[PDB]
Amino acid sequence: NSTTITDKLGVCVEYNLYGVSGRGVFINCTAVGVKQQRFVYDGFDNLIG
Amino acid sequence: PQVYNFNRLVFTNCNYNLTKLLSLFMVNEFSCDGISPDAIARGCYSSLT
Amino acid sequence: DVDSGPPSSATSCKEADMRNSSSEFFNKQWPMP
Amino acid sequence: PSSYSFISKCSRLTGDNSHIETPIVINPGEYSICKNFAPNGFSQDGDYF
Amino acid sequence: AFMLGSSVGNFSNGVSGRYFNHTLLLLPDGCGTRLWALYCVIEPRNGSYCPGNSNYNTFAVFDTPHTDCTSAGYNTNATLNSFKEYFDLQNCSFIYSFNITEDENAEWFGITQNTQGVHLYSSRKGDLYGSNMFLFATLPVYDGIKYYTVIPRSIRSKYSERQAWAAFYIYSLHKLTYLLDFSVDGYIRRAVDCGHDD
Amino acid sequence: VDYFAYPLSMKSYMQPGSAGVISQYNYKQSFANPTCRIFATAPANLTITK
Numbered sequence: 104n105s106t107t108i109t110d111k112l113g114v115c116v117e118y119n120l121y122g123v124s125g126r127g128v129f130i131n132c133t134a135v136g137v138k139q140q141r142f143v144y145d146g147f148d149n150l151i152g
Numbered sequence: 153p154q155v156y157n158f159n160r161l162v163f164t165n166c167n168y169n170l171t172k173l174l175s176l177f178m179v180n181e182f183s184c185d186g187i188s189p190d191a192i193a194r195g196c197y198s199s200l201t
Numbered sequence: 202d203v204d205s206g207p208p209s210s211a212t213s214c215k216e217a218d219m220r221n222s223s224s225e226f227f228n229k230q231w232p233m234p
Numbered sequence: 235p236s237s238y239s240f241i242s243k244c245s246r247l248t249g250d251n252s253h254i255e256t257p258i259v260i261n262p263g264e265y266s267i268c269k270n271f272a273p274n275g276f277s278q279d280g281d282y283f
Numbered sequence: 284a285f286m287l288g289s290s291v292g293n294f295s296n297g298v299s300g301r302y303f304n305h306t307l308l309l310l311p312d313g314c315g316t317r318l319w320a321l322y323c324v325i326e327p328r329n330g331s332y333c334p335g336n337s338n339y340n341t342f343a344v345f346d347t348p349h350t351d352c353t354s355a356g357y358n359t360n361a362t363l364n365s366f367k368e369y370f371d372l373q374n375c376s377f378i379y380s381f382n383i384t385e386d387e388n389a390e391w392f393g394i395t396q397n398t399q400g401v402h403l404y405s406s407r408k409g410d411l412y413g414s415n416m417f418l419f420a421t422l423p424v425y426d427g428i429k430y431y432t433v434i435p436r437s438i439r440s441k442y443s444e445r446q447a448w449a450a451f452y453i454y455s456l457h458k459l460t461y462l463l464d465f466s467v468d469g470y471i472r473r474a475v476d477c478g479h480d481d
Numbered sequence: 482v483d484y485f486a487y488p489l490s491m492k493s494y495m496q497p498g499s500a501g502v503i504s505q506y507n508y509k510q511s512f513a514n515p516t517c518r519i520f521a522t523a524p525a526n527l528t529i530t531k
């Protein structure tokens with residue numbers, strides 16, 4: 104059942120989001136990047152969005 | 153087919169039941185490079201060829 | 202194999218259908234590098 | 235299948251009288267130009283086409 | 284309109300440009316509202332002025348604007364039927380179809396091939412009012428695509444319906460290192476070709 | 482020493498990283514100490530039975 108982040112913002116959680124696996128903190132932000140691509144990375148290929 | 157006329161399968165955006173497929177065949181040799189069979193059985197992928 | 206539909210029942214082709222031309226007809230160079 | 239088959243030679247004959255013989259080899263993950271001759275497996279061992 | 288294959292040679296009379304095996308066809312259709320992806324075996328019909336006949340110069344695709352692109356309905360097999368007038372579609376591996384919206388914008392189309400098949404990119408996807416190409420189709424084409432041929436389109440415009448048509452350019456892709464500049468909204472509007480100059 | 486009866490045709494199912502039922506439910510080799518796998522055949526005329 105643990106499938107949403109609405110009321111768990113700010114806490115360290117693990118994630119499996121369409122197969123990408125990791126842990127980190129989720130914070131509501133202004134939409135950047137391309138929404139179609141579903142992920143925003145950085146220059147070192149770390150997920151930051 | 154034969155070896156020079158191999159058939160290629162590419163899997164994207166789907167779920168597999170590797171064990172149902174693993175139990176149908178009788179393995180004799182394997183040699184992985186950069187991954188292991190258990191990691192193939194427990195992971196998520198952009199594509200599978 | 203998959204079905205491509207019904208074949209073409211036209212016996213003859215349209216005979217060059219804007220006739221062939223490989224010459225100074227086509228030199229309208231509008232470069233877009 | 236009827237048997238196991240593979241290509242044992244693939245070569246181009248050039249020169250004035252096709253007197254020189256150079257091999258044509260595949261790249262990794264690719265098909266051989268020679269597969270078009272007997273694409274379902276060779277019938278006899280030694281089938282010099 | 285394109286014709287991508289692996290083996291090429293002369294026709295019967297001797298004109299070049301014949302594909303002998305499974306051939307990829309990218310034929311836009313529906314008066315610029317549909318894209319056809321066909322991976323078929325292509326057979327020269329023996330009829331007059333067709334690729335099998337002796338009196339054959341060149342093949343082409345077309346459509347009759349007042350019957351095909353009429354207001355009442357848009358025929359979606361016009362260019363494909365005009366194609367079949369020249370060739371027979373046998374042993375078709377797959378036939379895909381992609382919808383296209385009608386406009387007069389400037390778009391980009393790219394095509395590559397790797398181990399995972401044939402990849403099609405278009406600016407219409409993702410960035411319609413820009414110029415960045417996003418992958419929209421992957422085709423199970425695993426044979427080499429050694430050759431390609433631009434298929435001459437010809438709108439059957441009569442004297443009252445004659446219209447001007449834009450030219451297109453085809454740039455080869457090379458194995459090069461670049462430097463890109465992503466905007467805040469993720470799109471690329473500036474780059475540097477590292478081998479061009481000092 | 483861990484020893485048991487095992488068929489030779491199945492000895493790829495006890496390799497490091499294998500994905501079958503042997504490593505899941507029968508025997509997984511540990512690598513905390515220096516270790517070694519051996520697959521052998523016992524001649525039938527000795528005290529060992531089948």
Ligand SMILES: *[C@@H]1O[C@H](CO)[C@@H](O[C@@H]2O[C@H](CO)[C@@H](O)[C@H](O)[C@H]2NC(C)=O)[C@H](O)[C@H]1NC(C)=O
Nearest residue numbers: 166167168169170171172173174175176177502
């Ligand atoms: C994954 O594969 C296993 C093996 O096929 C499935 O388990 C069997 O499913 C069938 C369904 O008709 C049952 O009749 C059997 O009793 C199950 N047991 C076995 C070991 O054969 C399992 O359902 C598959 N899982 C999914 C969800 O795909």
Ligand SMILES: *[C@@H]1O[C@H](CO)[C@@H](O[C@@H]2O[C@H](CO)[C@@H](O)[C@H](O)[C@H]2NC(C)=O)[C@H](O)[C@H]1NC(C)=O
Nearest residue numbers: 203204205206207359360363364377378379380
């Ligand atoms: C227009 O072309 C499409 C694709 O060639 C035809 O659609 C196929 O027709 C066959 C035969 O009826 C069917 O078995 C397939 O299921 C159809 N689907 C596709 C996309 O493969 C269509 O019939 C043609 N229509 C006309 C006007 O002839």
Ligand SMILES: *[C@@H]1O[C@H](CO)[C@@H](O)[C@H](O)[C@H]1NC(C)=O
Nearest residue numbers: 269270271273290303304305
């Ligand atoms: C490809 O076409 C050529 C000539 O049409 C034919 O000789 C060859 O067998 C074909 N390849 C196949 C059927 O794999």
Ligand SMILES: *[C@@H]1O[C@H](CO)[C@@H](O)[C@H](O)[C@H]1NC(C)=O
Nearest residue numbers: 202324326371372373374375
């Ligand atoms: C291909 O088409 C022919 C008809 O031209 C048919 O006889 C044959 O079974 C089909 N299949 C293949 C791949 O040969």
